Enzyme design. Structure first.
Site, PDB file in Angstrom:
ATOM      1  N   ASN A  38      53.080   9.972  76.291  1.00 58.88           N
ATOM      2  CA  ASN A  38      52.080  10.969  75.887  1.00 58.88           C
ATOM      3  C   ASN A  38      50.712  10.341  75.817  1.00 58.88           C
ATOM      4  OD1 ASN A  38      51.289  13.520  74.960  1.00 58.88           O
ATOM      5  ND2 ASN A  38      51.452  12.906  72.809  1.00 58.88           N
ATOM      6  N   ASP A 103      56.293   4.248  75.518  1.00 57.12           N
ATOM      7  CA  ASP A 103      56.072   5.407  74.639  1.00 57.12           C
ATOM      8  C   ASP A 103      57.212   6.415  74.719  1.00 57.12           C
ATOM      9  OD1 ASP A 103      54.240   8.301  74.227  1.00 57.12           O
ATOM     10  OD2 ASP A 103      54.240   6.682  72.648  1.00 57.12           O
ATOM     11  N   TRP A 104      56.979   7.704  74.923  1.00 54.82           N
ATOM     12  CA  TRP A 104      58.111   8.626  75.074  1.00 54.82           C
ATOM     13  C   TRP A 104      58.899   8.348  76.315  1.00 54.82           C
ATOM     14  CZ3 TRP A 104      60.447  10.935  71.439  1.00 54.82           C
ATOM     15  CH2 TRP A 104      59.733  11.211  70.261  1.00 54.82           C
ATOM     16  N   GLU A 127      55.198  -1.268  74.218  1.00 55.31           N
ATOM     17  CA  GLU A 127      54.678  -0.258  73.323  1.00 55.31           C
ATOM     18  C   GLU A 127      55.638   0.933  73.229  1.00 55.31           C
ATOM     19  OE1 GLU A 127      51.861   0.501  71.204  1.00 55.31           O
ATOM     20  OE2 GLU A 127      51.989  -1.696  70.923  1.00 55.31           O
ATOM     21  N   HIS A 269      47.679   0.552  72.728  1.00 59.92           N
ATOM     22  CA  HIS A 269      48.900   1.254  73.123  1.00 59.92           C
ATOM     23  C   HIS A 269      49.099   1.336  74.624  1.00 59.92           C
ATOM     24  CE1 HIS A 269      52.332   3.846  72.983  1.00 59.92           C
ATOM     25  NE2 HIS A 269      51.732   4.784  73.726  1.00 59.92           N
TER      26      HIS A 269
HETATM   27 CL   LIG Z   1      53.176  11.060  70.644  1.00 63.84          CL
END
Ligand SMILES: [Cl-]
Length: 294
Positions: A38, A103-104, A127, A269
């Site tokens: 995201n 991330d996702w 990350e 990130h």
């Molecule tokens: Cl998020």
């Protein structure tokens, strides 16, 4: 750092909807599957893929509702993404893969690996999502922001109505300044506010302070799997980081089997935007030793 996206579009229809993906490199080996999070897309991998494509197929989908993929009217829970990515992988006929995840995209990739462990030859990660048992484990600079994101009123105002994830969180979590050309690539899927649903549901799904319980449980489960798996792992980390601060990366170096850590230097990130050439070159040189089936 390159701003262009010199990859031809590919599309596959799954579960009624088209998903866009990058697909480059030779067809006769083990593909490398790149999973963004995201509020990004396959654009995030644009400067990493060229290091890997010479030797390996690179497949980089845009998650449903993101990038150049279609926009069904979904709630865009993690479970929606799981369903669409599961179906994407089968539609392409993938058997064994190497995962490169963020991330996702890392929640998706680790959840898929736990369920399909015989099909994962290696995992390069950065990350990535782990449980945050309390808000104190979440980085202080981002705590009030994410607490506000995780509301039905203020969070929707910020993310949907003001585009805060694209205009705020994304550039604030790159150490170098993103250019306006880069920002326009990230903005393009989300020019119409209503299309920002996934950007708000994602932070609401993060496993923080026990909530939502389903995601906490499934992230605990994939982390338990990861800590017991002999699969080769390559973990990139930056300073100060966001989800994986330096001391966490060092703990994981010691606590994950067959794990190599790579310090990328400054990073928050979106590490791919600060040091794509080290990430790509290190992935590329790590792939050959994963091939053999012992
Ligand atoms: Cl998020």
């Amino acid at each position: 750092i390159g701003t262009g996206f010199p990859f031809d579009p590919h599309y596959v229809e799954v579960l009624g909807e088209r998903m866009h993906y990058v697909d480059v490199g030779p067809r006769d080996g083990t593909p490398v599957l790149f999973l963004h999070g995201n509020p990004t897309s396959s654009y995030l991998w644009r400067n990493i893929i060229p290091h890997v494509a010479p030797s390996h197929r690179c497949i980089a989908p845009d998650l449903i509702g993101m990038g150049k993929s279609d926009k069904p009217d979904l709630d865009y829970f993690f479970d929606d993404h799981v369903r669409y990515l599961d179906a994407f992988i089968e539609a392409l006929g993938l058997e064994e893969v190497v995962l490169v995840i963020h991330d996702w995209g890392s929640a998706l990739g680790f959840h898929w690996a736990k369920r399909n462990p015989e099909r994962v030859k290696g995992i390069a990660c950065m990350e990535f999502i782990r449980p945050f048992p309390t808000w104190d484990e979440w980085p202080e600079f981002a705590r009030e922001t994410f607490q506000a994101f995780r509301t039905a009123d203020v969070g929707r105002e910020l993310i949907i109505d003001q585009n805060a994830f694209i205009e705020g969180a994304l550039p604030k979590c790159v150490v170098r300044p993103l250019t306006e050309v880069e920002m326009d690539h990230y903005r393009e899927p989300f020019l119409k506010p209503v299309d920002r649903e996934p950007l708000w549901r994602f932070p609401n799904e993060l496993p923080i302070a026990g909530e939502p319980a389903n995601i906490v449980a499934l992230v605990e489960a994939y982390m338990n799997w990861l800590h017991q798996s002999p699969v080769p792992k390559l973990l990139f980390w930056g300073t100060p980081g966001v989800l994986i601060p330096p001391a966490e990366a060092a703990r994981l170096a010691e606590s994950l089997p067959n794990c190599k850590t790579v310090d990328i230097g400054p990073g928050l990130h979106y590490l791919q935007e600060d040091n794509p050439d080290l990430i790509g070159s290190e992935i590329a040189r790590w792939l050959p030793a994963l091939h053999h089936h012992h």
